[PDB]
């Protein structure tokens, strides 16, 4: 049974890392890349992704934590800290002589209570008004941004999120695809240069600025026809006399005209190719005053096909007007000193793919905003998926631990050993929130538990961000029901996965 | 502390067992004891083996100390304590590794004793079934097979027992015990060994002082006066002492220091039986057999005589019968004598000195077997019958002690196991068969349904078979086997209670 001590102490090695990153006042960690690059992060999702531990039990903890990232996206360290607490309380229960199978069965019976206690505090957002949904949605989005440089422009970045998701969801189906939203950002500019763009930005210069960098709507014609071509603007040499070379060089122009005639005859307004253009390919396109774009990858080419209902045309002569992508307009937009000479393709409306333009002074600043944009969008997508929410951050973990303790008083059996510890484990969240915020580690727990019973049942949380009182409605600290359910649900799966491992057999390579 | 000291404790007591293991049995192997002086001694005596055994590990001081009390308290049982206990501890460590708390192990072993004492008390036998059937003849044969008379022990052992069968005494307020110095036996050259005769009564080591004096006086009820002071000339006075024998009425006279020529002839004229020069120790037993009191000097406030009706003993019939170079005085019975006699015939006194060697041992051993009233079927019967009965006891509790009831019971096979190993015979065959013979004895026999369903079959170490130890005659005291088990668990508990050792 002593291997249970080795496995639990191993989990503490993981917890002793992740613990300190919990909180809007969290402590950042250095990531040394295999190449030597330094990244500074507060998100345990990136910490666990790059964290390489040789302990095989710890390798399990990471692989299982991936499941919360693939689903909710924001609950990474929640299941990590909860699991270390479930295992820490188990270590004492093992010393008390409880067989591991009885420890696990009790954690499940106590968990089934806490899940139902959470339900007592749920409330709906969208039941009121579309403007008030946008209001409460906006009020919630600002909760995720406080850990990033956007702390100054958090209103400018939060105002993005409202329509960023609403534009790509289905109000009646209530199912939004994250892949409809792209984050397109570069290292440079300033964070105030970040924009929410209705469409896609390819970061391409139309091969030359003399080439038409834009197509006007053509008095409102059928959009701008976009030719997605997979080949360079060129045809897919012994000179024994003068007459011969006169054609050798021209033959490129013969194909240039053939490709241009395919453009003009097909109706393609902008020619977007996978490879580059020839110097005379631009010249022949300049003779016909036809815009075109070169060196575009398929990810960018599909964003054309997606928003414009277009086609990836395999060859220049395979153009067809029905296969040409139709956009409201296309234009090359530079921001400030941007020399990349980017282009924006839009429907001038809710596109089937939208792009958040991100600029930032340092590479870290950019990734911090983009990582927040991932989670800030997930905050919205989780609020859309399940309108049932709680003012629960720091309050529900205490509310749940209060209920489990009250149940232990009614158990009267071997279950008293587990139900008492399940509440003690749940309390590690408000405790860790306090320690990582610089507050009293014990007095926070007593203050929180007293106010939710001695005063009355309400939403009373921690003071991490800094605020004069514990009122979670005044700070508007909101978490989804499905999120807190997956946190406590996967935590018990984490505990069972660890407690049910009796031997770690590590084989070698012959 | 913990399993470390528990493992060390067992290894210590098993090392002690490695010393006594080979010594169990009449055919066992001896151990050589060596001191720092340079002397050596070789013995199978369990008390000596343990007394000189140097024990350094502190656990063994408990096991040996018990056996030291066993010998000083009882006088035997020193080998069984170590062998029985070491098996109990060997198997107890297996219970420890099986998550059995030391307290539960001890509790169950004590319960098994409460059950086992009852079983042993029920299955034992009393000092009976020894007459008319070869229970003391085979016990005597056991002691006599090592004697030169061994070939003829069937004839000699009949007298060893038949004589002892009649010497029941009350000793200290009716103990029912046999006299050790008794059955005055005569080493004689008379005839062949198998023709030695058993005498129905006691023979005082003497004859009639003068062949002229009458040798049988007062056949019905006879009084005997034992005198020391001589009747010899220092003469009418020492002769007159015969006239005092006449007036005082002593019919058989035991005069220790001799009889004058006139006194010898005066006994003839007086028709009184005269005797000269008897062994003093026999005369003291005559004082306790017939009552004739040896008078060392005649005082009694100036009294000089056999002291009419005072110093005379009482006997039924006194006869001197001639048995072909054996003319000695025979004592039939009386109120209380408990005496007898045996005639030994053989090649010569030097060969009859083997009967001195034989009877010294054979009379002592047979008496020791009849010293104890309740006796035990020997040969692993008391160990193996417990093995079978204690298995069924497993159903009486059947909770947590059920595991300890089994290991306690199985440990009792270390004795019939060791008896076989030390005997050179197949240990696995003999022990298993002992179990099966005692196994069925617990089935229908106690239901009184038996064709040949009878226990008390035990291990024969000589003929190499399992035999009815009642008809074979191997018995051990019930006070020994009961005290042996009581002692064994005393040390087993004592060692199992050691969970910490601190060295300061």
């Amino acid at each position: 049974l002593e291997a249970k001590k080795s496995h639990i102490l191993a989990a503490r090695s993981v917890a002793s890392i992740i613990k300190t990153s919990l909180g809007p006042r969290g402590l950042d960690k250095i990531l040394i890349s295999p190449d030597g690059e330094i990244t500074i992060t507060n998100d345990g999702a990136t910490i666990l992704s790059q964290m390489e531990l040789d302990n095989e039990i710890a390798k399990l903890l990471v692989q299982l934590s991936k499941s919360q990232d693939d689903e909710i996206g924001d609950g990474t360290t929640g299941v990590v800290v909860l699991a270390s607490a479930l295992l820490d309380q188990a270590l004492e229960l093992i010393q008390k002589g409880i067989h591991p199978i009885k420890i696990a069965n009790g954690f499940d019976e106590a968990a089934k209570l806490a899940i139902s206690k959470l339900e007592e505090t749920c409330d709906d957002i969208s039941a009121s008004n579309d403007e008030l949904f946008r209001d409460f949605l906006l009020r919630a989005a600002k909760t995720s941004l406080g850990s990033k440089i956007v702390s100054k422009d958090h209103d400018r970045f939060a105002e993005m999120a409202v329509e960023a998701v609403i534009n790509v969801m289905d109000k009646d189906r209530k199912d939004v695809d994250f892949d409809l939203i792209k984050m397109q950002g570069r290292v440079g500019g300033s964070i105030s240069d970040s924009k929410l763009i209705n469409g896609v930005i390819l970061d391409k210069d139309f091969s030359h600025p003399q080439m038409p960098k834009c197509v006007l709507p053509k008095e409102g014609s059928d959009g701008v026809k976009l030719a997605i071509l997979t080949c360079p603007f060129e045809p897919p040499l012994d000179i024994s006399s003068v007459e011969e070379y006169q054609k050798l060089q021209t033959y490129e122009q013969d194909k240039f005209k053939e490709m241009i005639d395919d453009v003009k005859k097909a109706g393609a307004d902008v020619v977007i190719c996978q490879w580059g253009f020839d110097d005379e390919a631009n010249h022949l396109l300049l003779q016909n005053d036809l815009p075109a774009v070169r060196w575009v990858g398929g990810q960018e080419l599909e964003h054309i096909a997606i928003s414009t209902n277009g086609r990836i045309v395999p060859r220049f002569q395979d153009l067809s007007k029905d296969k040409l992508g139709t956009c409201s307009r296309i234009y090359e937009q530079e921001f400030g000193t941007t020399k990349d000479r980017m282009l924006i393709i839009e429907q001038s409306k809710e596109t089937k793919t939208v792009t958040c333009f991100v600029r930032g002074s340092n590479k870290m600043i950019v990734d911090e905003a983009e990582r927040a944009l991932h989670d800030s969008l997930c905050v919205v997508r989780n609020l859309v998926k399940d309108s049932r929410v709680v003012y629960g951050g720091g309050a529900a973990e205490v509310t749940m631990s209060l209920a489990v303790s009250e149940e232990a008083d009614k158990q009267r059996g071997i279950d008293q050993y587990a139900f008492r510890g399940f509440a003690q484990a749940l309390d590690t969240i408000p405790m860790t929130l306090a320690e990582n915020s610089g507050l009293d580690p014990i007095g926070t727990l007593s203050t929180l538990k007293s106010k939710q019973l001695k005063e009355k049942i309400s939403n009373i949380g921690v003071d991490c961000l800094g605020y004069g009182s514990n009122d979670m409605k005044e700070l508007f600290v909101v978490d989804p029901f499905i999120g807190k359910k997956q946190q406590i649900l996967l935590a018990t799966q984490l505990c069972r996965m660890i407690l049910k491992i009796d031997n770690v057999i590590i084989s070698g390579k012959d | 502390s913990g399993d470390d000291i528990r493992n060390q404790n067992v290894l210590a007591t098993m090392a002690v067992a490695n010393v006594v293991k080979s010594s169990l049995g009449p055919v066992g192997l001896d151990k050589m004891l060596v001191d720092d002086i340079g002397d050596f001694t070789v013995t199978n005596d369990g008390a000596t083996i343990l007394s000189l055994l140097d024990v350094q590990h502190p656990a063994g001081k408990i096991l040996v100390e018990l056996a030291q009390q066993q010998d000083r308290e009882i006088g035997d049982g020193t080998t069984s304590v170590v062998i029985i206990a070491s098996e109990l501890l060997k198997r107890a460590n297996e219970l420890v590794k099986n998550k059995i708390h030391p307290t539960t192990i001890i509790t169950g072993f004590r319960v098994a004793l409460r059950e086992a004492i009852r079983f042993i008390n029920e299955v034992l036998s009393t000092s009976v079934d020894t007459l008319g059937k070869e229970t003391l003849i085979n016990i005597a044969k056991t002691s006599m097979s090592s004697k030169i008379i061994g070939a003829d022990s069937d004839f000699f052992s009949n007298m060893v027992v038949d004589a002892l069968l009649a010497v029941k005494t009350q000793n200290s307020k009716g103990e029912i015990k046999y006299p050790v110095k008794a059955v005055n036996v005569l080493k004689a050259h008379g005839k062949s060994a198998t023709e030695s005769l058993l005498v129905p009564g006691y023979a005082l080591n003497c004859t009639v002082a003068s062949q002229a004096m009458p040798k049988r006086i007062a056949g019905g009820n006879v009084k005997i006066a034992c005198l020391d002071l001589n009747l010899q000339k220092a003469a009418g006075i020492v002769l007159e002492r015969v006239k005092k024998i006449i007036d005082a009425g002593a019919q058989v006279v035991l005069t220790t220091k001799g009889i004058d020529d006139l006194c010898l002839k005066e006994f003839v004229e007086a028709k009184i039986m005269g005797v000269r020069r008897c062994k003093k120790e026999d005369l003291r037993r005559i004082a306790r057999a017939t009552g004739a009191t040896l008078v060392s000097s005649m005082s009694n406030l100036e009294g000089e005589e056999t002291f009419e009706s005072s110093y005379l003993g009482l006997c039924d019939e006194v006869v001197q019968a001639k048995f072909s170079d054996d003319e000695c005085i025979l004592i039939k019975g009386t109120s209380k004598h408990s005496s007898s006699s045996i005639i030994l015939r053989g090649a010569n006194d030097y060969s009859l000195d083997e009967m001195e060697r034989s009877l010294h041992d054979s009379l002592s051993v047979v008496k020791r077997t009849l010293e104890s009233g309740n006796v035990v079927p020997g040969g692993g019967c008391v160990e193996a019958a417990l093995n079978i009965y204690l298995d069924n006891f497993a159903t009486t509790v059947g909770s947590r002690e059920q595991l300890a009831i089994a290991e306690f019971a199985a440990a009792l096979l270390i004795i019939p196991k060791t008896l076989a190993v030390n005997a050179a015979k197949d240990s696995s065959e003999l022990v298993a068969k002992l179990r099966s013979y005692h196994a069925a004895s617990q089935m229908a026999k106690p239901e009184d349904v038996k064709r040949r369903s009878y226990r008390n079959y035990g291990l024969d170490l000589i003929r190499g078979k399992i035999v009815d130890e009642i008809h074979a005659g191997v018995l051990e005291p019930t006070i020994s086997k009961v005290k042996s088990l009581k002692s064994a668990l005393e040390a087993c508990v004592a060692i199992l209670r050691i969970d910490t050792m601190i060295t300061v």
Binding site: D254, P314, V504, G508 | K433
Partner: protein, 497 residues
């Protein structure tokens, strides 16, 4: 060397037992196995565990080989082989030290296995309709296999699929390949989708949407292997069209076959969908030959690597082919294929390991129903059969005298390692359960065994906890042989270099 070579060999097999002893039971523990490919598998499946142990000691190689045979010959009971075989050797330690020879021990083990097989035959109850209806024969058994699990609340969901999953097979032909499981991340447990036949997750790695109508009421499935995608100065183009025209006509040679569904083992891109979009042929490459051979066993087609030699004989038709958005991803399904004897279940759940727990909980329940139809003779579960053989072999040792008496007694003692590990791995009081079970069995009840619901003993026939007779017989016979192989070794000769 000598008798101590056996001591060393037993010690090695004990090490195997200690690693495998926590694995007995549906309530049992897992082993984390790190393979040389850095492929980590955490499993309680003794067949997988034994595959990956990588045992090197010569004696343990024999023990594992015996247990791997249990899998191929029977398929279940591989854990009981390792536990039973090991304890029969562990109980032999006191016999070797007392001088009992290898023939004396092995002759006794052969005597016991003969005595036991016959008592297994007496215990056998022929359950076809004997006191059981046809539906509840399978249903109540599968409901038992799933009781008190994480899927307990969805027991009706999984049993409804599980019982009919096997019942949907050919009752004359049972084979594990006919019930396949997909690990579909996303969705709740009750969101798992049962496919009447075979489905695959569309590994087609390129675009091409809004073309090639993908659903067919009567498809004609064609299987390819090759890639039919393409990927003077003017003359440079000719080499591209030379190859393009070749594969483009080969794309037409698929149209000449007449296929509605085109499969490939190699990536198929948009350049290949050029023709398939023009002629409207659904194509899915990178498809496993297992699902393709299931198509061969579903619709009865044939796989042709190239496009030219294909005749109508290569085509097959199913009752329904549909690509569905169910599962936050596109999945293609075949249902009701004329030749199909197969079915598949797409497992959806909160995580891959949550699926793994449902997967192996189902895999066992599948085998529970599988052998309900395979085996006619059943024996008691919950260790009741092990107590049944225990009582009978104890009685034989009472009526048999000689060295066999002690050896047979050891056999009986070792039979209780099965109920012992069933008790310890479930967290029960092993001392109490072993004693209450032994006495109650000796009172005449042959069906008392381990109850996992409430720590107690009870009738496993009433609980419908049934084990195949041949599982018990072939495993017991195999374990006896294993003890004959290890206990019979006197020397190890190693040719080193």
């Amino acid at each position: 060397q000598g008798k101590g070579q056996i001591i060393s060999n037993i010690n090695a097999c004990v090490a195997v037992q200690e690693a495998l002893k926590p694995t007995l039971g549906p309530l049992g523990s897992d082993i984390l196995i790190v393979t040389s490919n850095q492929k980590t598998t955490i499993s309680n499946d003794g067949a997988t565990i034994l595959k990956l142990l990588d045992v090197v000691h010569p004696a343990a190689k024999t023990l594992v080989d015996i247990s791997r045979a249990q899998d191929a010959e029977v398929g279940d009971g591989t854990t009981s082989v390792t536990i039973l075989a090991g304890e029969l050797m562990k109980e032999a330690k006191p016999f070797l030290e007392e001088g009992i020879s290898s023939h004396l021990i092995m002759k006794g083990y052969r005597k016991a296995v003969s005595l036991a097989v016959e008592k297994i035959n007496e215990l056998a109850v022929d359950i076809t309709s004997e006191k059981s209806s046809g539906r509840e024969l399978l249903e109540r058994c599968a409901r038992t296999a799933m009781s008190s699990k994480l899927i307990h609340n969805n027991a009706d969901f999984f049993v409804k699929m599980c019982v009919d999953a096997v019942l949907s097979l050919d009752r004359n032909d049972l084979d594990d390949k006919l019930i396949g499981i997909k690990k579909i991340p996303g969705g709740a447990m009750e969101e798992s989708l049962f496919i009447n036949g075979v489905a695959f997750k569309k590994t087609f790695s390129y675009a091409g949407f809004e073309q090639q109508p993908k659903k067919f009421n009567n498809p004609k499935i064609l299987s390819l292997n090759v890639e039919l995608e393409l990927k003077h100065v003017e003359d440079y183009q000719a080499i591209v069209d030379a190859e393009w025209q070749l594969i483009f006509e080969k794309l037409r040679q698929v149209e000449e076959t007449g296929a509605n569904i085109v499969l490939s083992k190699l990536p198929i891109g948009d350049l290949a969908t050029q023709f398939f979009a023009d002629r409207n042929i659904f194509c899915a490459g990178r498809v496993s030959a297992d699902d393709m051979n299931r198509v061969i066993q579903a619709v009865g087609g044939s796989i042709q690597s190239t496009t030219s030699d294909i005749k109508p004989e290569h085509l097959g038709t199913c009752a329904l082919f549909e690509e569905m958005q169910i599962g936050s991803e596109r999945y293609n399904l075949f249902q009701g294929c004329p030749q199909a004897k197969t079915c598949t279940l797409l497992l959806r759940g909160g995580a891959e390991q949550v699926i793994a727990e449902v997967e192996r909980s189902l895999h066992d329940a599948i085998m529970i129903v599988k052998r309900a139809l395979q085996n006619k003779l059943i024996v008691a579960g919950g260790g009741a059969t092990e107590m049944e053989v225990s009582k009978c072999l104890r009685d034989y040792s009472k009526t048999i005298a000689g060295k066999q008496q002690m050896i047979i007694n050891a056999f009986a003692k070792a039979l209780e390692v099965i109920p012992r590990q069933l008790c310890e791995n479930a967290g029960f009081d092993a001392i109490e359960i072993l004693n209450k079970l032994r006495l109650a069995h000796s009172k005449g009840e042959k069906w008392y065994g381990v109850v996992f619901e409430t720590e107690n003993i009870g009738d496993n026939f009433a609980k419908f906890v049934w084990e195949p007779a041949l599982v018990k017989i072939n495993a017991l016979n195999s374990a006896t042989e294993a003890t004959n192989l290890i206990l019979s070794v006197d020397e190890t000769i190693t040719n080193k270099g």
